[PDB]
């Protein structure tokens, strides 16, 4: 069945006139096999990605994670890794890509060194939330000073949000009525734009003189989207200001606030009871090094949450691994040989006959070494 | 004057007389703000005050309202107790 790919384009929404607001775009050129793996990971169900080292397994996984994050804001993505180095590489590739740190979360031991630029632990995310709170409260104070409203409205996140709902939303409604007036031109839109004083620090001009009404409205909507993004960040910070205990803040961040939560399989196994007690509600699970992690240690992420309506809420499972790579560490020789404890879910599924997508292009070593492991693959 | 004066304890070291006046201005006009500084040189603490202050308002009703407001309230991240 020759599928028709109806390809459609949409204008990307502006996130503000600042160069920081420009979204990050992917720069690597994926192979057709990698693109098919990304498509299968984005589509619901079971995805199996057989990847040799240096074939971009982490790149494909991070691309699938970013695609899921952009497509479904209501879904939760559970990242399972085998090593803290793999977790750090995944977080660094996401940060090179674009997922908000207010939704990024890493679970693990607090004594482990974090090689990433940002501290993705519970206390590190709390500190980042507090720093963003201070910066955005200063921004709200600057906005209130520009608008000339009485009082200091950057006192707290709730006060900032109430100031937004009281002042900016009727002003934006009046501006939208002016826009909807058919006799109003682009210059009238420019002079009716009320955030010129707040966005005076943007690179001038805010609206070019040769710009027409469509892109003037796009720039105004980008400025309003930047303001709304700041206020939504403050609204997300606000439950952390509400809670007084750091354990309560971390529990609320794990249960509700974070949309992408990452850990190791052993940490998930030891925290299965706490996660089930807190009542996690993940939708998709993406995991790496499936041949390096045993079977039940990966089934525990598949049963972290409580079942409901006679089944599970899990929709997507992604297994990024390589069954031609090393087996896990088992001390017992009898359990290694007779009991077959060394074989993993990846090896079991590829022996059973589940369809797998194999990466067929390496980008790590010399051509001689590519042959030196291509005689096996 | 004693009935119009409210003693606030448990104040943080970063809390100053201006901050106390700004906090107590909502309940009414404050006639005076007395912050007892750590004048003892034997104490090695670098706190500019002793953690207690007295805010005297213009009216006893305003002083009682300020006591009810700042009593067991959160001030600069620390619990401050306001009493008559």
């Amino acid at each position: 069945k020759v599928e028709t790919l109806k390809v459609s384009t949409y204008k990307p929404p502006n996130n503000g006139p600042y160069p920081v607001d420009a979204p990050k775009l992917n720069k690597i050129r994926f192979t057709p096999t990698q693109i098919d793996a990304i498509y299968s990971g984005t589509q619901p169900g079971l995805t199996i990605i057989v990847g040799p080292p240096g074939t971009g397994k982490t790149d494909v996984a991070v691309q699938i994670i970013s695609n899921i994050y952009h497509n479904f804001p209501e879904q939760k993505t559970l990242l399972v890794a085998h090593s803290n180095q793999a977790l750090n590489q995944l977080f660094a590739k996401i940060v090179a890509l674009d997922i908000d740190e207010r939704h990024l979360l890493r679970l693990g031991h607090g004594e482990e060194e974090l090689e990433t630029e940002g501290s993705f632990s519970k206390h590190g995310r709390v500190e980042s939330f507090l720093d963003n709170r201070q910066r955005f409260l200063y921004e709200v104070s600057r906005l209130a000073a520009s608008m000339g409203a009485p009082g200091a409205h950057g006192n707290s996140a709730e006060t900032a949000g109430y100031f937004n709902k009281v002042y900016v939303e009727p002003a934006w409604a009046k501006f939208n009525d002016i826009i909807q007036r058919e006799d109003v031109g682009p210059e009238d839109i420019v002079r009716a734009f009320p955030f010129h004083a707040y966005f005076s620090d943007a690179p001038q001009p805010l609206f070019p003189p040769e710009a027409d009404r469509e892109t003037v409205l796009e720039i105004a909507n980008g400025c309003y989207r930047h303001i709304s993004k700041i206020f939504e960040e403050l609204a997300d910070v606000l439950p952390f200001e509400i809670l007084r205990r750091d354990k309560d803040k971390a529990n609320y961040l794990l249960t509700s606030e974070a949309r992408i939560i990452a850990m190791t399989s052993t940490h998930a196994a030891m925290k299965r009871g706490e996660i089930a007690s807190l009542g996690f509600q993940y939708d998709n699970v993406i995991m790496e090094e499936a041949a390096q992690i045993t079977e039940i240690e990966n089934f525990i992420p598949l049963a972290l949450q409580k079942p409901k309506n006679g089944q599970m809420a899990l929709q997507r499972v992604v297994l990024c691994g390589d069954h031609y790579q090393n087996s896990p560490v088992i001390q017992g020789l009898a359990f290694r040989h007779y009991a077959n404890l060394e074989q993993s879910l990846f090896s079991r599924l590829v022996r059973l006959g589940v369809p797998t997508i194999n990466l067929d292009q390496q980008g790590r070593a010399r051509p001689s070494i590519s042959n030196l492991y291509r005689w096996r693959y | 004057r004693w009935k119009a004066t409210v003693y606030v304890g448990g104040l943080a070291p970063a809390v100053t007389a201006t901050v106390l006046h700004e906090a107590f201005l909502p309940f009414g006009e404050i006639a005076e703000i007395n912050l007892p500084r750590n004048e003892n040189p034997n104490t090695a603490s670098t706190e500019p005050h002793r953690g207690f202050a007295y805010v005297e308002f213009e009216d006893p009703e305003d002083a009682k309202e300020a006591i009810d407001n700042m009593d067991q309230s959160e001030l600069f991240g620390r619990v401050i107790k306001v009493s008559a």
């Binding site: 031991h109 052993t266 196994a269 030891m270 925290k271 299965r272 009871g273 089930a276 039940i296 240690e297 089934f299 525990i300 598949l302 049963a303 079942p307 006679g310 089944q311 599970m312 | -």
Partner: protein, 94 residues
């Protein structure tokens, strides 16, 4: 019996106290400063089933205990995983 080992009782490290039984508030400052004594105390959670078995058998296993053996965390994080799999077993549909 060849090694002479008679009794092994699993215990849970709850906390470590000094020679005076006080909590170590700053472990880094305790490590950096000069310790007055090299005697420490460990508050432990003993095995419940093992303690009940010793109580019903009236054997002085804990009185005969003379050694403590510790392990690394990576190789010693086995009991919460086993408890999680046991809870999964008691659960019906995972």
């Amino acid at each position: 019996e060849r090694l002479g080992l008679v009794h092994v009782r699993a215990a849970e490290i709850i906390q470590v106290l000094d020679d005076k039984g006080k909590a170590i508030r700053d472990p880094q400052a305790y490590f950096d400063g000069h310790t007055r004594s090299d005697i420490r105390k460990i508050q432990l959670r003993l095995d419940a089933t093992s303690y009940k078995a010793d109580t019903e058998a009236n054997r002085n296993v804990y009185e005969d205990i003379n050694l403590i053996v510790r392990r690394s965390s990576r190789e010693n994080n086995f009991k919460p995983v086993l408890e999680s799999i046991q809870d999964l077993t008691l659960s019906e549909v995972p």
